[PDB]
Amino acid sequence: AKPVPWVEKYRPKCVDEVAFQEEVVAVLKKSLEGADLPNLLFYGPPGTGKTSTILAAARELFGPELFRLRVLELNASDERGIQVVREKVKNFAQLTVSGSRSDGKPCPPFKIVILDEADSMTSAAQAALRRTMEKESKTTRFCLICNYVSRIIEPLTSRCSKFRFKPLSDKIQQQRLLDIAKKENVKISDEGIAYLVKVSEGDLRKAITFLQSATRLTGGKEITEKVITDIAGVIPAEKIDGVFAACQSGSFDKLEAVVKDLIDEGHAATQLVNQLHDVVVENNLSDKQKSIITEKLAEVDKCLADGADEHLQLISLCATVMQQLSQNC
Amino acid sequence: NPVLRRPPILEDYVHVTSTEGVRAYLVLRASSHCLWVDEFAPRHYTELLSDDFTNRCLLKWLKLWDLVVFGHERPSSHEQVLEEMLEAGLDPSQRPKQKVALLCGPPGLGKTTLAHVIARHAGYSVVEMNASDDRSPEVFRTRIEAATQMESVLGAGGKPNCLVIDEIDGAPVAAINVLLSILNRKGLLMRPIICICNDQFAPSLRQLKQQAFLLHFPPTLPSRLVQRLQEVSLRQGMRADPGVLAALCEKTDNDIRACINTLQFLYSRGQRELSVRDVQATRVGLKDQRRGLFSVWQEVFQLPRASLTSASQRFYRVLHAAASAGEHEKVVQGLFDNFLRLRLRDSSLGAVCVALDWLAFDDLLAGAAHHSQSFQLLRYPPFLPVAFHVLFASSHTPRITFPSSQQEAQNRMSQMRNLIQTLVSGIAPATRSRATPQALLLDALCLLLDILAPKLRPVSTQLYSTREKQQLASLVGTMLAYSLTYRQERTPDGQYIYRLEPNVEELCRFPELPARKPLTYQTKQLIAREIEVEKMRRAEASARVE
Amino acid sequence: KIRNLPWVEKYRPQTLNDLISHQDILSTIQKFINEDRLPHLLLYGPPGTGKTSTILACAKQLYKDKEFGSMVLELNASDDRGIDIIRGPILSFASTRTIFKKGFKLVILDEADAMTQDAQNALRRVIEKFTENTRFCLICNYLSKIIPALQSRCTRFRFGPLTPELMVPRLEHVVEEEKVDISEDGMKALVTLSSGDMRRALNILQSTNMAFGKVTEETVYTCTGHPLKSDIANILDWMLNQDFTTAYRNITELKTLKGLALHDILTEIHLFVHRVDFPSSVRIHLLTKMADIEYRLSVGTNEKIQLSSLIAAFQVTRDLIVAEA
Amino acid sequence: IEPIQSRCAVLRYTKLTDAQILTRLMNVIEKERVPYTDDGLEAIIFTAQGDMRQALNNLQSTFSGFGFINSENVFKVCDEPHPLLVKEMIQHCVNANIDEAYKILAHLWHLGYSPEDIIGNIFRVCKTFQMAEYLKLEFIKEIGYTHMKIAEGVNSLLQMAGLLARLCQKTMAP
Amino acid sequence: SLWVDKYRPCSLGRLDYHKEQAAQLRNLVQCGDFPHLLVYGPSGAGKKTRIMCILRELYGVGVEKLRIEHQTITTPSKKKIEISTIASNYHLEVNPSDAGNSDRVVIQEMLKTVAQSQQLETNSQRDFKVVLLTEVDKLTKDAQHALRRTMEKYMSTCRLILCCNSTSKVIPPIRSRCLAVRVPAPSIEDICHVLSTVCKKEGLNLPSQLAHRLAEKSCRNLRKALLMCEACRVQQYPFTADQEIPETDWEVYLRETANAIVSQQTPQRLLEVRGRLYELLTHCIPPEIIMKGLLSELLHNCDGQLKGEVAQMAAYYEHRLQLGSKAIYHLEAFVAKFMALYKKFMED
DNA sequence: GCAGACACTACGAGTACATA
Numbered sequence A: 001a002k003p004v005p006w007v008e009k010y011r012p013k014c015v016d017e018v019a020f021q022e023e024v025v026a027v028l029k030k031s032l033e034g035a036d037l038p039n040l041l042f043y044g045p046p047g048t049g050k051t052s053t054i055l056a057a058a059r060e061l062f063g064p065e066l067f068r069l070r071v072l073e074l075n076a077s078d079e080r081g082i083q084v085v086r087e088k089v090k091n092f093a094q095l096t097v098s099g100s101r102s103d104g105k106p107c108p109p110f111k112i113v114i115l116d117e118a119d120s121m122t123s124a125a126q127a128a129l130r131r132t133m134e135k136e137s138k139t140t141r142f143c144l145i146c147n148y149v150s151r152i153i154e155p156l157t158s159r160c161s162k163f164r165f166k167p168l169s170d171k172i173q174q175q176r177l178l179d180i181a182k183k184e185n186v187k188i189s190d191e192g193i194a195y196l197v198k199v200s201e202g203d204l205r206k207a208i209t210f211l212q213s214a215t216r217l218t219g220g221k222e223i224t225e226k227v228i229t230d231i232a233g234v235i236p237a238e239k240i241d242g243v244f245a246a247c248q249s250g251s252f253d254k255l256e257a258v259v260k261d262l263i264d265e266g267h268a269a270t271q272l273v274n275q276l277h278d279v280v281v282e283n284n285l286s287d288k289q290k291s292i293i294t295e296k297l298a299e300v301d302k303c304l305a306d307g308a309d310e311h312l313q314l315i316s317l318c319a320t321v322m323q324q325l326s327q328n329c
Numbered sequence B: 001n002p003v004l005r006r007p008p009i010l011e012d013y014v015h016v017t018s019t020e021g022v023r024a025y026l027v028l029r030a031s032s033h034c035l036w037v038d039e040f041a042p043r044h045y046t047e048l049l050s051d052d053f054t055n056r057c058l059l060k061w062l063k064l065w066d067l068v069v070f071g072h073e074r075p076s077s078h079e080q081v082l083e084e085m086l087e088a089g090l091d092p093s094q095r096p097k098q099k100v101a102l103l104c105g106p107p108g109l110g111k112t113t114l115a116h117v118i119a120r121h122a123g124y125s126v127v128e129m130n131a132s133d134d135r136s137p138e139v140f141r142t143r144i145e146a147a148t149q150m151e152s153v154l155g156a157g158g159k160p161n162c163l164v165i166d167e168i169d170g171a172p173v174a175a176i177n178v179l180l181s182i183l184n185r186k187g188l189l190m191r192p193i194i195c196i197c198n199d200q201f202a203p204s205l206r207q208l209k210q211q212a213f214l215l216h217f218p219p220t221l222p223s224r225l226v227q228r229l230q231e232v233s234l235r236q237g238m239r240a241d242p243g244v245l246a247a248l249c250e251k252t253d254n255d256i257r258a259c260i261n262t263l264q265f266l267y268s269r270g271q272r273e274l275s276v277r278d279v280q281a282t283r284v285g286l287k288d289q290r291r292g293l294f295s296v297w298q299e300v301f302q303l304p305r306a307s308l309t310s311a312s313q314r315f316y317r318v319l320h321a322a323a324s325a326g327e328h329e330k331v332v333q334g335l336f337d338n339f340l341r342l343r344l345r346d347s348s349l350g351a352v353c354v355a356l357d358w359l360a361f362d363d364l365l366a367g368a369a370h371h372s373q374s375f376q377l378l379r380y381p382p383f384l385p386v387a388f389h390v391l392f393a394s395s396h397t398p399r400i401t402f403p404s405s406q407q408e409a410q411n412r413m414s415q416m417r418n419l420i421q422t423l424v425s426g427i428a429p430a431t432r433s434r435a436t437p438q439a440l441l442l443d444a445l446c447l448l449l450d451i452l453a454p455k456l457r458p459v460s461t462q463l464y465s466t467r468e469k470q471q472l473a474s475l476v477g478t479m480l481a482y483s484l485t486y487r488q489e490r491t492p493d494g495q496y497i498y499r500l501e502p503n504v505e506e507l508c509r510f511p512e513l514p515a516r517k518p519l520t521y522q523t524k525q526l527i528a529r530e531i532e533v534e535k536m537r538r539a540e541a542s543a544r545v546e
Numbered sequence C: 001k002i003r004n005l006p007w008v009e010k011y012r013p014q015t016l017n018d019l020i021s022h023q024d025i026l027s028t029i030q031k032f033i034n035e036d037r038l039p040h041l042l043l044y045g046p047p048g049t050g051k052t053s054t055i056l057a058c059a060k061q062l063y064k065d066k067e068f069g070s071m072v073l074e075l076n077a078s079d080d081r082g083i084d085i086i087r088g089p090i091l092s093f094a095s096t097r098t099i100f101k102k103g104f105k106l107v108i109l110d111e112a113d114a115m116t117q118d119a120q121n122a123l124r125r126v127i128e129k130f131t132e133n134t135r136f137c138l139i140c141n142y143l144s145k146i147i148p149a150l151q152s153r154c155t156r157f158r159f160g161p162l163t164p165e166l167m168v169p170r171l172e173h174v175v176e177e178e179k180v181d182i183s184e185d186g187m188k189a190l191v192t193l194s195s196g197d198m199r200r201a202l203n204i205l206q207s208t209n210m211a212f213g214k215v216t217e218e219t220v221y222t223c224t225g226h227p228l229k230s231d232i233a234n235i236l237d238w239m240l241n242q243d244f245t246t247a248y249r250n251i252t253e254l255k256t257l258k259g260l261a262l263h264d265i266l267t268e269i270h271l272f273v274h275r276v277d278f279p280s281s282v283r284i285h286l287l288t289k290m291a292d293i294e295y296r297l298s299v300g301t302n303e304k305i306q307l308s309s310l311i312a313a314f315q316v317t318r319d320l321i322v323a324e325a
Numbered sequence D: 001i002e003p004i005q006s007r008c009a010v011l012r013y014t015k016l017t018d019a020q021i022l023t024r025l026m027n028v029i030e031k032e033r034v035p036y037t038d039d040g041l042e043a044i045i046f047t048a049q050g051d052m053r054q055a056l057n058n059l060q061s062t063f064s065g066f067g068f069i070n071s072e073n074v075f076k077v078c079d080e081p082h083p084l085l086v087k088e089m090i091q092h093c094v095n096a097n098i099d100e101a102y103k104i105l106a107h108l109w110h111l112g113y114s115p116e117d118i119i120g121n122i123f124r125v126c127k128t129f130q131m132a133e134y135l136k137l138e139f140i141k142e143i144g145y146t147h148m149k150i151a152e153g154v155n156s157l158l159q160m161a162g163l164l165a166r167l168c169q170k171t172m173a174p
Numbered sequence E: 001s002l003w004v005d006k007y008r009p010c011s012l013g014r015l016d017y018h019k020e021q022a023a024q025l026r027n028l029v030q031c032g033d034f035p036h037l038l039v040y041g042p043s044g045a046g047k048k049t050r051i052m053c054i055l056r057e058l059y060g061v062g063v064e065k066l067r068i069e070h071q072t073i074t075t076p077s078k079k080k081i082e083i084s085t086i087a088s089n090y091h092l093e094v095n096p097s098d099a100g101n102s103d104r105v106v107i108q109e110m111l112k113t114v115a116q117s118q119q120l121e122t123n124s125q126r127d128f129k130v131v132l133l134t135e136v137d138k139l140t141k142d143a144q145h146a147l148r149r150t151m152e153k154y155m156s157t158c159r160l161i162l163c164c165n166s167t168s169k170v171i172p173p174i175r176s177r178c179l180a181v182r183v184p185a186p187s188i189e190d191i192c193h194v195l196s197t198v199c200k201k202e203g204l205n206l207p208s209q210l211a212h213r214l215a216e217k218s219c220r221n222l223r224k225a226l227l228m229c230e231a232c233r234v235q236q237y238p239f240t241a242d243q244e245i246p247e248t249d250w251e252v253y254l255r256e257t258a259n260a261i262v263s264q265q266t267p268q269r270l271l272e273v274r275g276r277l278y279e280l281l282t283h284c285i286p287p288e289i290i291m292k293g294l295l296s297e298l299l300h301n302c303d304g305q306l307k308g309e310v311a312q313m314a315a316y317y318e319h320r321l322q323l324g325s326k327a328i329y330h331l332e333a334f335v336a337k338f339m340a341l342y343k344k345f346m347e348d
Numbered sequence F: 001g002c003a004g005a006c007a008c009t010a011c012g013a014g015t016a017c018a019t020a
């Protein structure tokens, strides 16, 4: 009886437990009924449930005894070169479809090849999947899982039926989090769950991780908004007001002081970019100032995505918004 | 005007409103059996077409072997070193100190012809070893040991064997090591060896250059080559002006074989008088020259002297020459290491900034082509030397040196990484986990060296105080915690010095910084002796506990 | 009998008459077959246009089922096609006779752009010397990845994108064979979202028929997740006609309600920009900014900030367009 | 290599002209009794681009598919050469005419050419274009910057339009 | 041992600062179903100390019995690459950035063999093992993409604690799979309290002025503050208030490099500064820290209307340095751009 | 009948380069 984290304890074991992805859930339930399953391409933001949906669909199609004979999962944690596609994928695709479910449930007459994280697969290795998917489509199906669909070549995009996984809405995510908190015998306030579904930004794995960590930190009493705010790394609004006051002052020394205070406090630069953008798009600045401040925010977010230094990007963004705030003064 | 104040009547429109609230409307809707190079090939010494200094130097070098080969006492700048090598005497085993004559130069000059003619002139028998042989080190050793370590079958009156090794630049490094092993074996070498290469700066011939009689071939004199081509055309019954032959000589880049082959194709027997336009045509006689690095750097950094004055012709010439040079990374390193030492007229540093932008563009192209396996991004970095030519064109005479900063930086970085990995390997794993090597280098190295050097007076241990002994014990403990110790070093000046066994001073210290007071010899010797007796008493304490 | 197949493979043009678009090219290849003067073919074009199906129908028309295994040597990117394969199996297939029935043989090199340049240079004299014995068909999506020697040795046919007027009867055939209830706007949505791709037309048709049971405009744009053109017109109107805050609120509410992605919004706004009679400098600025925003979405970025930058790129040019007058 | 080229008489062949291909095409036509017109043979020459193999292949394809050689039968199976429109696209990009350049780009896009082929033809035209040297260098740098994005995975009509807009800006930013 | 290692706390109840976070981390790992952890913050804040305190809370005192394990990993190019791991009977510490660009092979092969095997003893040890990945911000994106499925498949028998400085270099698939634990730098009062308790445990007296100057000069790095305090006690045993503090050599070398930049704006001075930057890069100083030190020194010599453009140029060229592979090109480009801007500002 | 020698192919290892 070992404890398990809630992202694996409450993983969807069937298609009916998958939330908010209604079109692909309807397609997979029709494939459970016996319809013709095509080749699938799942893409979207992280934590939306691309892996759990296809794993639940495969374990409902084949069951426990035929999951090892009909499902081949290849991801970025194992080597996927051109020779792995030429040998391991192609010889699996040429195997016979045999074996029946012992519980009396119907079994589809194909295998499923799950190529999770197809962004990391090279363009040469993706080119060898084309006639493998076309010729062996009578006996196997291919599901490509990725986050950026531009990192998969256009023949494989055309060969697969694309399904985009949307970020989960606040109603569905709040309902799932309240169901998980109900099944775990913990209590969370309405403001706490509202701030949780605002913080998680459609990432249900992040929401479940934050809920489990707030349950462990709280210990079993009421989960308020303060524990959620402290556990999410949300920068307080006084720091944002001090940043904008240092920008309105027009001095670079106070700008360096507030940037060094935010860096030394360990606040992530992506969270600061999000909060500065939220203040900027919801104030009484002019349209031109808001325009170039938001464009600088997009440039800073792009540079942070490429692993640039947080201090230099934040001081460049602060210099730009300081110039914009002191230009009209 | 794309913007209409009034809305359109028939076409579809999309409204545009500014911040002040005024609407704007946009529209939504055996003469015939042999080659001429073989027919006119030189068979005597008097008809050679090379530089006379190189022929005389090779003949004098081969005549220095007559003491040990023929058993007769009597045989019958770059020039100053070769004249000194011919008059520096002989080794005590009555042989020249340079036992290999190395011939280098561009093709079509007559290096093989000079080697064979000079070998047959001095009474030797030419043993030819070329690139069509196996060139494996076992076959290389067997061939050289057959050619050089035995006498002749004919006995008295038999010709000695002079080993001529053509195309030594393409030989593997192990074959050169075999050649150097049979060169410096003290199985003693008694016969001369001649090596011919096209590129003296090959990586496999680095140790061969320091031991050989280096004879660099200059390009052939155009007057002598024009006279020889005139004699060849007169022998074949063909008429040609000196001007058209000089045009052919400057077209073929002073290549004897290419000029004679071009004349053999162009003459035939349909016509006799060769025309200037046939040589000036690019259909016959033009070959792709492999340009050197320094010629490319000169062509880039210096404008041609005064048609050819158009900028597009210089653009295409610089692009094609930099493409035809090869070794693109060396060209980029030379451009990076030579463009700041010029007499730059751009005092605003904009040309330097856009040249560095071009260098970063080349670096990003190399990274993207080596990341996404998309090597069609490598057709753009050929335009980096022509960008440097456009930006830094001058009529002066720049001094171009070889690029060495990036390779020395990489070598020093590898040495410092090896020194860091040697330093962290001695630390205990309990204290290795508490800090990364990067944080230990940035934070805990210079301050650690400030800890390890206290203000210690040159006084013996029996006259120390309680605080001095406690500080010394703490110093020895902190030195033993990081597995550091002092050992003696031998100096050519005759004094002994103590130094750290991992030399972590060069990890910390910098050249332009002010000097700090170091620890003396007596204090460092006392510290080393205290470390040794602390190790002894630590072993004794470990024996006492267990 | 019924088979569990995707509709891109269940409905494949096994004969040359079942293909829809390239009538001149297919007529010329049919007259090549009927006269027995088939040359070395080079079929190139965008994906999903019918290059593999054409040569498979030609191979089934030329050769019978009792001689197909010894007459056609089909190699693709899933097989090893190195220079030892060109010197080995391909050269031995090209240089030998047949076994059962006398005739010319066929070597189909599908996805020939993925071959190395050494193999393509070794392929030249195999094609040229054995023209009377065998024929070579090269299929690629990129003509720049095939060397000009092989482009000279093979006559080239461009299998261009399928026009939406010609994709309608094949989609209607698939619909009447699969018993699909589809309206007119569903067909228009299929042929609009396909963009000259028959594969993804059948993929969107099958996914929409399984997801909803009927194929209309709303079901296609819901299953695919593509924004409606009215949504793009509303986004352009909000971006060009009001201030930053109200446009941000309206576009954010539309993206939250409809579940839109910024890539397709950027694509449709880019298509809308060239239709709007912008000034030249405004058009250049909008194209550069939209290309920058499209490039920024290929990494781990925040889509809300890029949406704000998309609004910003038009909020900058509002005053320039109005002051142009 | 240079030592092999020194050992041989290096002969350099140039591209065949229109009349030189036309004489051999007339010989093949008179051997094969092919009916033809003058503009059809001019279209065959235009599609040949100095290649006799492509001229013979296009002539045989047009004769087998249609039985007559006029311009419409040649251009129904063969195609116009790619850089002959990329040249005026680059010419419109030099004069900062973004509308005509996008018209040529969209015409090349609707014919099914991949962005890699289009940017390869763009670089091929810009390598030997007749303009300023510094403008050509920054054009080539912008082409390489866009080609890195195309090879990275993002390759749409918006990226090519942004490349054309950047090439038009490089003129207006001295 | 030095003062950085002699008085490091062992458990979560003995931490001098972030005591509320210490109690929260104690309550987090009590049940055993805690998720993967992302301990992030500035360097010297105390992240590794809290990670070892979490390991002390989970297992017994046997996590302090560390040993060096040498692993030989085979590249796809069949080149043997040597890496070193610190391991105990309960956990493992891996730094995959020591293998360089082949860290993806380390993640795919070394971590998967650890995760695929359960523990030998299940009574003295717990039901799961902990893998410490240090400096995951220095990992390439390929290694982070290889990391993500191992973090989900074997998270009931193997837990991961990832340590980094900036979470911007961590990809959002990895950041979605783990709980982010923020460890801020200690304040001036916290560093003064730590240094005062260290000096009281050493039998010494530390003034408040000297402790405040040591806290201010360390830039809120407690490791560097403790090293500077021990260096000040080897240099001078009476702790004076105005006692000089020793400095690191690369920092003053960076300051003299920036002074050489602002002294003259010529291509010859640019060549000399390139030589100085080569000397900085050969000593294994990271180029982003070189950019940060340059911007920290160049903005002291700039006027008030020039600092924003220099900061934006420094950020732009540091981003281009992160995109590129040769740091000296982008460093010399930033220095040349600053020289051009400074000459234009001085001449006008 | 069993030990030594001969060449045989498969396999391990090192290196270059990939554009127009």
Ligand SMILES: Nc1ncnc2c1ncn2[C@@H]1O[C@H](COP(=O)(O)OP(=O)(O)OP(O)(O)=S)[C@@H](O)[C@H]1O
Binding pocket: A006, A007, A008, A010, A011, A012, A017, A018, A019, A020, A021, A044, A045, A046, A047, A048, A049, A050, A051, A052, A053, A146, A147, A204, A205, A206, A208, E148, E172, E173, E174, E176
């Ligand atoms: N739609 C969903 N319904 C129910 N649980 C979900 C859903 N999405 C995520 N979860 C939970 O979060 C965990 C993560 O789901 P995943 O399938 O790994 O998401 P993902 O799409 O794979 O993210 P990436 O792109 O692989 S990083 C699951 O194991 C569930 O516990």
Ligand SMILES: Nc1ncnc2c1ncn2[C@@H]1O[C@H](COP(=O)(O)OP(=O)(O)OP(O)(O)=S)[C@@H](O)[C@H]1O
Binding pocket: B037, B038, B040, B041, B042, B047, B048, B049, B106, B107, B108, B109, B110, B111, B112, B113, B114, B197, B198, B228, B256, B257, B260, D003, D006
């Ligand atoms: N004086 C001469 N008159 C006419 N032909 C000559 C004369 N000297 C040499 N040649 C010919 O020019 C060529 C010289 O090339 P070789 O000496 O054989 O080789 P090489 O000059 O060392 O150049 P490489 O590097 O081997 S290509 C040969 O074909 C000779 O026959």
Ligand SMILES: Nc1ncnc2c1ncn2[C@@H]1O[C@H](COP(=O)(O)OP(=O)(O)OP(O)(O)=S)[C@@H](O)[C@H]1O
Binding pocket: A130, A155, A158, C007, C008, C009, C011, C012, C013, C018, C019, C020, C021, C045, C046, C047, C048, C049, C050, C051, C052, C053, C054, C140, C141, C159, C170, C198, C199, C202
């Ligand atoms: N012209 C067409 N007529 C009818 N169906 C077509 C046509 N083109 C494609 N299809 C359908 O799309 C499927 C795939 O067509 P393919 O021949 O594989 O396209 P393709 O031209 O080979 O694309 P690539 O380059 O190989 S990815 C076929 O099985 C048909 O169902």
Ligand SMILES: Nc1ncnc2c1ncn2[C@@H]1O[C@H](COP(=O)(O)OP(=O)(O)O)[C@@H](O)[C@H]1O
Binding pocket: B434, B435, B439, E003, E004, E005, E007, E008, E009, E014, E015, E016, E017, E042, E043, E044, E045, E046, E047, E048, E049, E050, E194, E222, E223
């Ligand atoms: N609570 C604490 N009390 C006393 N000293 C501490 C405390 N936390 C950290 N330190 C000291 O500060 C230094 C921080 O280094 P480390 O723990 O490796 O954190 P990081 O990984 O952030 O550098 C350690 O050497 C440790 O001795």
Ligand SMILES: [Mg+2]
Binding pocket: A050, A051, A116, A145
């Ligand atoms: Mg996944």
Ligand SMILES: [Mg+2]
Binding pocket: B111, B112, B166, B196
């Ligand atoms: Mg020779």
Ligand SMILES: [Mg+2]
Binding pocket: C051, C052, C110
């Ligand atoms: Mg195909």
